[PDB]
Ligand binder design. Structure first.
Ligand SMILES: [Cl-]
Lengths: 275, 100, 9
């Protein structure tokens, strides 16, 4: 199958409370497998998926040392950003970092990611060519010029193509079926009368993995995008996801409406009707 | 900094039936900054020993957390999610509806 | 595993 390893870092300055708080979470696809929190008791990387628990203490100790050095790096990034943005020393600020590798079935890099958000806004992102940067604003152009001059894209590219893919390969080997699985959605339609002239049809997808899914309503095969209420895909808490899509239907017209469900676990999309 | 109000969904892990053990979820997302407070309510009272996920975010930088507890829904018991965030002037309360 | 290369904005 197609797979990814991604790390999501959040650093938050707490002015007058010492070092910024550093949090990391690590994922294979939509499966969280590790966390690190600079505020936890005896900060150490911790397992959050069953198949990583087999890693020896040399794993947890090594990753702990890397996270501690990352936290200090992010502290310096936050200090530099304060200067670029002419910000005071009194305000709290956030750096979000995400990097990782997507591989196809051959297990070679398909797509590399390495990107940054400052105070909840795009800052700078490594472009899909892994050779060039997109800066969100004039401040981020300072970082872009520095990173271009220092040829850092070449090191990030070599990392994403090499080490990143090798760790992902090992984790897929550890995880086996727990990571290879595509759990198809359980689908059903419910009917919710509004008045005597109209009813909501709600098309549900439950218990699917991974999270990526498309739910659409059609009326005699014509897409109803503008008249569909679609909730954000939401976690069930058992490493499956949920979604629903709803459309308001005139009474007697229910059999014109079809719900269409596309998911990796379905060889072809499912078509459902109010039944 | 530009602040963003949390989105909130409250929902069960499994399609609910009265008397059947289940999990009550409150999913908060798209909030900035990251500090947030989430309580699950039974008939307006805070449920104890609610667990939550580790702080994460989506590729579009949307922070998210899941707060969850075991519960046995009934016909008459009211469940809700109550969120405090710097963007909210009062706690935001979203009632659990088994059809959403 | 987390990367051990570090970069300052
Ligand atoms: Cl979504």
């Amino acid at each position: 199958g197609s797979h990814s390893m991604r790390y999501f870092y959040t650093s938050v300055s707490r002015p007058g409370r010492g070092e910024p708080r550093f949090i990391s979470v690590g994922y294979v696809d939509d499966t969280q497998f590790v966390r690190f929190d600079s505020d936890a008791a005896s900060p150490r990387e911790e397992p959050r998926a069953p198949w990583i628990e087999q890693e020896g203490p040399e794993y947890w100790d090594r990753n702990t040392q890397i996270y501690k050095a990352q936290a200090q790096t992010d502290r310096e990034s936050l200090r530099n950003l304060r200067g670029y943005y002419n910000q005071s020393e009194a305000g709290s600020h956030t750096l979000q970092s995400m990097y990782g590798c997507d591989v196809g079935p051959d297990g070679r890099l398909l797509r590399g990611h390495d990107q940054y958000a400052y105070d909840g806004k795009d800052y700078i992102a490594l472009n899909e060519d892994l050779r060039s940067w997109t800066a969100a604003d004039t401040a981020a152009q300072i970082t872009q010029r520095k990173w271009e001059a220092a040829r850092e894209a070449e090191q990030r590219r070599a990392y994403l193509e090499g080490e990143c893919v090798e760790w992902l390969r090992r984790y897929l080997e550890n995880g086996k079926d727990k990571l290879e699985r595509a759990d198809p959605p359980k689908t059903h339609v419910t009917h919710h009368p509004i008045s005597d002239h109209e009813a909501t049809l709600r098309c549900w997808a439950l218990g699917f993995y991974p999270a990526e899914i498309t739910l659409t309503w059609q009326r005699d095969g014509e897409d109803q995008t503008q008249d569909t209420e679609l909730v954000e895909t939401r976690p069930a808490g058992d490493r499956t996801f949920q979604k629903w899509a709803a459309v308001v239907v005139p009474s007697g017209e229910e059999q014109r409406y079809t719900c269409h469900v596309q998911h990796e676990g379905l060889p072809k999309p499912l078509t459902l009707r109010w039944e | 900094m530009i602040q963003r109000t949390p989105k909130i969904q409250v929902y069960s892990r499994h399609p609910a039936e009265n008397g059947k053990s289940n999990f009550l979820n409150c999913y908060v997302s798209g909030f900035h900054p990251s500090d947030i407070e989430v309580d699950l309510l039974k008939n307006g009272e805070r449920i104890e020993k609610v667990e939550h996920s580790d702080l994460s975010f989506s590729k579009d930088w949307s922070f998210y957390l899941l707060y969850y507890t075991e519960f046995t829904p009934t016909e008459k018991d009211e469940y809700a999610c109550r969120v405090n965030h710097v963007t909210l002037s009062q706690p935001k309360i979203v009632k659990w509806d088994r059809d959403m | 595993s987390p990367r051990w290369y570090f970069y300052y904005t």
